């Protein structure tokens, strides 16, 4: 089902994508520690996944959502960083993908924060950073992030210090953090964008 | 300079800290009023306060108190909960975290109970509760409470009913003399004799 389409550099649709990958750059209480320490990508390759049954899938379910929310999806693009990123582009998004552990509850979590989502990217806690330095701050290899659409529909609002179709996450404390959401159903989101890049090491 | 580090929770040190959470819930005379009603808790998030120079602080007043007490620190992991959770581990202890109407007296205050620090997470009485249900017993919203390592040295025991250190004393024991079942408090007047090693964020349960 699935192909691969490089943006070029030049295309306004890169542009924008990379600009929301740059700008939605935070630091982190973990000073780091998890996704490496950076203020900015270099950003390698974007590409638009193309997969006309999971877009289907996609569209279906938000139909539905919305006639469940006054004709409203409340469609958001939102980062997702994952080991699987290979696996969701192929199958889409599924009850594997979930983290169990989630700070707002079992299910598939999504970012504004893309430097959030670069956390994910070898594992929870950034696991043992890359395969080939085993450094969770490695500017050598290459990182993936997932930009996706997500449906949020009616959003069960959160605060950390059944009839809801998500959770936002909202932060408290870390009035620099944006939010954080999640969706129980794996047809809610489709992974519209593949982002191949490098954290860059400051100067 | 403080970094938090997330613990997992396979790390046998998340689980120690969670158990410690968990076993020292208990029974409050106030039914329940400041800190709500449950039996335990649900544990979001362990994470280390990692900070050389408050660690450096620390251990600096623990070897001062040690010295001054025959070689013993009289060191003690406890809880602390406080409106000013995020400053303390950003900032450290002092006089601005003191309960200056505390029952054992003016200073900074550290429970054994876990479920006592729990009352003081929105304020002294557990203020209005929540900042977004004005709810005390709420268990939908998140609470943050401090495990920390603390310095006692020479401790004064004081027996309860339920500023300046006591003269010659480094801290206060405060014992529970009706309630055996209720653990101790404990006081301490330099906010340099506490670090701030955990920061565990979590829910109050409701209970069926
Ligand atoms: C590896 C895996 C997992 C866990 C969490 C995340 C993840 N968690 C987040 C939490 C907050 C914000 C973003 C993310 C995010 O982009 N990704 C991704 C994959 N853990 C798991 O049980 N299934 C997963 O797919
Ligand atoms: C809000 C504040 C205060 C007062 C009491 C407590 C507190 N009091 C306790 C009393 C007994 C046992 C534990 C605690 C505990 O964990 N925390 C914390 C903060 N009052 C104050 O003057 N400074 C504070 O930080
Ligand atoms: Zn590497
Ligand atoms: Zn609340």
């Given at each position: 089902?699935?192909?691969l389409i490089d943006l070029s550099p030049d295309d306004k649709e890169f542009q924008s994508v990379e600009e929301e990958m740059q700008s939605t750059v ?13 203020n900015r990508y270099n950003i390698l390759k974007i590409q638009k996944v ?27 693009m939102l980062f ?32 504004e924060?893309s430097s ?28 993936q992030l997932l930009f996706c659409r ?42 519209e964008y593949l982002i191949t890049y490098q954290?860059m090491?400051?100067?």
């Amino acid at each position: 089902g699935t192909i691969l389409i490089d943006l070029s550099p030049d295309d306004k649709e890169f542009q924008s994508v990379e600009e929301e990958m740059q700008s939605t750059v935070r630091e982190h209480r973990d000073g780091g520690h998890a996704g490496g320490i950076f203020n900015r990508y270099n950003i390698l390759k974007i590409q638009k996944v193309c997969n006309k049954k999971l877009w289907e899938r996609y569209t279906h379910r938000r139909k539905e959502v919305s006639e469940e929310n006054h004709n409203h999806a409340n469609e958001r693009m939102l980062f997702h960083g994952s080991p699987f990123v290979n696996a969701i582009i192929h199958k889409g998004f599924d009850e594997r993908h979930a983290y169990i552990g989630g700070m707002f509850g079992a299910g598939i979590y999504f970012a504004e924060n893309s430097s959030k989502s670069n956390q994910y990217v070898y594992g929870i806690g950034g696991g043992t950073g890359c395969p080939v330095h085993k450094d969770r701050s490695c500017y050598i290899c290459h990182r993936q992030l997932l930009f996706c659409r997500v449906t949020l529909g009616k959003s069960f609002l959160q605060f950390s210090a059944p009839g809801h179709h998500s959770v936002t996450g909202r932060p408290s404390v870390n009035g620099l953090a944006l939010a954080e959401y999640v969706i129980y159903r794996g047809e809610q989101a489709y992974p519209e964008y593949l982002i191949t890049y490098q954290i860059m090491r400051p100067e």
